[PDB]
Amino acid sequence: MKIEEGKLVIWINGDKGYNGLAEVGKKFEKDTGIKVTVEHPDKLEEKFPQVAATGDGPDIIFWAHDRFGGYAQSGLLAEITPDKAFQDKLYPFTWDAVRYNGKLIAYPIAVEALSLIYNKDLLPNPPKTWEEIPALDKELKAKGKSALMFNLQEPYFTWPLIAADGGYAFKYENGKYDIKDVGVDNAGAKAGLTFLVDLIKNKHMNADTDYSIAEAAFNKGETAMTINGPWAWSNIDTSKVNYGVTVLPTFKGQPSKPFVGVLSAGINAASPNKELAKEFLENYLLTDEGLEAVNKDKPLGAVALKSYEEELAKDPRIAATMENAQKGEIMPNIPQMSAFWYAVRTAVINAASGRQTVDEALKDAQTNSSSKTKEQVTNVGGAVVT
Ligand SMILES: OC[C@H]1O[C@H](O[C@H]2[C@H](O)[C@@H](O)[C@@H](O)O[C@@H]2CO)[C@H](O)[C@@H](O)[C@@H]1O
């Protein structure tokens, strides 16, 4: 109703291959007459639940699977209906990532994990440990370069270090995540965040560094290393930088443990075009030709579609992505994930900027993460005085 019948509107993050996705949309339109419009709103993962709560928003939303349990619990995502032959085309573990309360609530697209990206002309042998980074930066600074820059504003990028020596989100046991058993303020989490904060205090990193600042610096050759996902490789290809993609550094001898996302496509529960969305996703996007179009724009990572992953696997960068994914953990998709991420975002930004100590910051994050959230998608705009 509110979403227009007879067309598809799609939202996807602006760092992904939205132009390639639009090409698949234009093919669909040429074949079927059905217009497909791709948009990449800022903060789409916050906008979606707000507008979808009223029956508006896109027909299809692309995001990592971790947000989708919350959306489904709120009644905002449709159960999908792929048949067995279709399900056979994708890796079983990717279907598990989009299963919520026994139901499939999105189409898996690709497996995303962070890797260490390095400039082979500044650093032909990248460091195997976090511990050696301060000395490396000291050496490079004397010559007008830095060792490492990555996004310090989103906790996704610092999580691998927090988790390395023992940090965790929710304990999983016997078919359930226990929201009362959270691992954000244990000794391992404290050790990792303390190491990051010390890097900042010793002027090896800047607390204000964000995604754009880090990407620009790496791609200009000002910093020897960054931490990012497969989507970023396209812009580095364009840049003058000769780069490699490798395993994340260890911390206290333990592998960094990135939280692994499955980029997924959910169908708005209010869409009058659920059948059109199914046809588009199963018969146009999740094909070798469709994924190629998106992947050529911005790499997806290790795709869920078996036939195309076999092609993409011939690539040391994908081998590295998989190595890092296997050392980390697939994110939970439970509704509590939103609270978890907001809590850890606050702790990381506050500790990095010197607004809180590490102990103070993570104690707060532990409290909010483990608080069973009576969640609402209501807002002030619908409020009425009674
Ligand atoms: O930083 C917290 C943030 O992490 C994840 O978002 C990732 C996403 O998985 C990637 O596809 C890519 O877009 O980078 C994002 C971080 O900027 C979680 O998916 C998200 O819920 C969480 O807020």
Swiss-Prot record:
Name of the protein described by the UniProt record: Maltose/maltodextrin-binding periplasmic protein
This protein's UniProt keywords: Periplasm, Signal, Sugar transport, Transport
PANTHER family: MALTOSE-BINDING PERIPLASMIC PROTEIN (PTHR30061), MALTOSE_MALTODEXTRIN-BINDING PERIPLASMIC PROTEIN (PTHR30061:SF50)
GO MF annotation list: carbohydrate transmembrane transporter activity; maltose binding
Claim: Cytoplasm is one of the keywords in the record: no
Reported induction: Induced by maltose and the transcriptional regulator MalT. Permanently repressed by cold shock in a PNPase-dependent fashion.
Chain segments annotated as transmembrane: none
Subunit details: The complex is composed of two ATP-binding proteins (MalK), two transmembrane proteins (MalG and MalF) and a solute-binding protein (MalE).
Family: Belongs to the bacterial solute-binding protein 1 family.
GO BP: carbohydrate transport; cell chemotaxis; detection of maltose stimulus; DNA damage response; maltodextrin transmembrane transport; maltose transport
Subcellular location: Periplasm
UniProt-listed Pfam families: SBP_bac_1
Subcellular location, principal: periplasm
GO-annotated cellular components: ATP-binding cassette (ABC) transporter complex; ATP-binding cassette (ABC) transporter complex, substrate-binding subunit-containing; maltose transport complex; membrane; outer membrane-bounded periplasmic space; periplasmic space
Transport among keywords: yes
Chain's role: Part of the ABC transporter complex MalEFGK involved in maltose/maltodextrin import. Binds maltose and higher maltodextrins such as maltotriose.
Annotated organism of origin: Escherichia coli (strain K12)
